[PDB]
Amino acid sequence: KLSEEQQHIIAILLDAHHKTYDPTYADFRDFRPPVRMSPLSMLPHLADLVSYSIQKVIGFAKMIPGFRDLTSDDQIVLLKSSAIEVIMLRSNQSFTMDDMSWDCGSQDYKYDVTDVSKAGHTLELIEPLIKFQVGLKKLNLHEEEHVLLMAICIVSPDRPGVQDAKLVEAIQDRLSNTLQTYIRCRHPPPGSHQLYAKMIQKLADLRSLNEEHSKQYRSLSFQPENSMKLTPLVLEVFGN
């Protein structure tokens, strides 16, 4: 059932994730310092964290089978629209349900709901974001399923501004069929029950999170004093 091409796709995506996600979190020392001790005291650190993660998301995307066959315009449209969603998905690796926080190896780099609020965001975003992290963690995805879901998210044909929607759809369909076949062949029950449908629900959840994050980002970044604390990459990708 899982064809050799489908096994190849999975192998490429696992390798791409290993090359672009560093679970030692060594580079966090390079970011502006978190300040917790109201002002948006965590904005400099979290802007650097987000900017670093965007770079890793682009590096992963470039390795998705078929992504490089798209025009530069379409690659750009797809990364601009999906980067926020892929950041939410990939951060699930460091999320822990012990205290509902993102634990990146040390106390300095352990982030909770208060840290997100100290970058300027409100419960309108943060409450659904925690519910998403919990629901995704509860799916107990195989790493194979986690990397396929990130790839499917990036290569979405309904993103605004997509030109060659039929080619985007053809690439995504190959990934979607790989995931559906992987679940049926390699994920034992009961964990596999309705798993594909539950993963696609997480993609719909991400669209809602994207819409809210974009609304609040627009309000935050409209104030020039906040935009001054962002990075050039964040301004280019999330908007200026």
């Binding site: 682009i58 590096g59 470039k62 530069s72 750009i76 601009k80 050039p232 280019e236 990708v237």
Partner: peptide, 11 residues
């Protein structure tokens, strides 16, 4: 309108 940093990271 131009995305030079993204374009550059995209090769």
């Amino acid at each position: 309108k131009n995305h030079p940093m993204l374009m550059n990271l995209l090769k």
